[PDB]
Amino acid sequence: TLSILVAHDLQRVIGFENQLPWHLPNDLKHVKKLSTGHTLVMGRKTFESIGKPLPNRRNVVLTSDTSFNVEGVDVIHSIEDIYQLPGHVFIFGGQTLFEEMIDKVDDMYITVIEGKFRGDTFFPPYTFEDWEVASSVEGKLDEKNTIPHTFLHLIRK
Ligand SMILES: NC(=O)c1ccc[n+]([C@@H]2O[C@H](COP(=O)([O-])OP(=O)(O)OC[C@H]3O[C@@H](n4cnc5c(N)ncnc54)[C@H](OP(=O)(O)O)[C@@H]3O)[C@@H](O)[C@H]2O)c1
Numbered sequence: 681t682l683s684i685l686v687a688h689d690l691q692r693v694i695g696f697e698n699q700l701p702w703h704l705p706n707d708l709k710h711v712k713k714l715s716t717g718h719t720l721v722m723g724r725k726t727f728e729s730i731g732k733p734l735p736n737r738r739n740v741v742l743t744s745d746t747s748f749n750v751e752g753v754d755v756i757h758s759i760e761d762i763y764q765l766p767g768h769v770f771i772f773g774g775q776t777l778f779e780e781m782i783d784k785v786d787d788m789y790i791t792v793i794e795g796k797f798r799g800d801t802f803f804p805p806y807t808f809e810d811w812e813v814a815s816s817v818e819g820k821l822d823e824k825n826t827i828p829h830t831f832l833h834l835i836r837k
């Protein structure tokens with residue numbers, strides 16, 4: 681299975697200055713639950729924002745840089761290499777990879793952050809005409825999680 685995994689706001693903002701625009705611990709938990717034991721594919725800038733590979737899953741970084749070789753990270757140099765990866769593969773970001781892959785993936789795990797943030801990077805537009813809502817779950821708010829959010833699993837029609 682090839683899936684997108686993304687958090688985007690009401691206007692599809694996903695990033696600002698190579699960081700997440702919001703702080704939302706429950707969404708990190710969400711990512712942890714979905715991707716532990718599986719594979720994340722991410723663009724080079726996304727990897728650099730994190731700085732080190734995420735624990736307990738395969739980290740794959742797409743870059744044109746043949747000098748790229750990071751401990752704990754597998755490198756690919758082409759989109760076509762993604763299709764060779766075994767198991768459940770999550771396209772993890774950022775804007776450029778999402779734009780390249782949204783017409784290719786089987787499904788999308790989207791956390792809709794229900795606010796309007798300043799962004800410089802965006803998830804591409806999509807229509808529910810092409811995507812069935814497998815599930816939609818309102819996130820729980822508390823002291824540590826103060827922005828409303830919804831977990832969507834969308835499957836290509
Ligand atoms: N909210 C979320 O769910 C979420 C998730 C992930 C990322 N983000 C955000 O997204 C933003 C970054 O997105 P971005 O588009 O600027 O960067 P990006 O997609 O993470 O990285 C782009 C880089 O990936 C490499 N690349 C992409 N396609 C390639 C291809 N076909 N062949 C070879 N290399 C390829 C290139 O690296 P080289 O230039 O090294 O060749 C390119 O410069 C950040 O703000 C980050 O915080 C948000």
Ligand SMILES: CCc1nc(N)nc(N)c1C#C[C@@H](C)c1cc2c(c(-c3ccc(C(=O)O)cc3)c1)OCO2
Pocket residue numbers: 685686687700707708710711712713726729730734735772773789790791
């Ligand atoms: C948690 C953010 C997020 N949510 C959703 N729904 N999809 C995504 N693709 C990303 C993402 C991402 C990258 C940019 C990112 C940025 C971070 C992160 C992480 C991150 C760190 C740890 C774990 C984990 O332990 O599983 C997961 C994501 C991941 O920590 C704070 O800054």
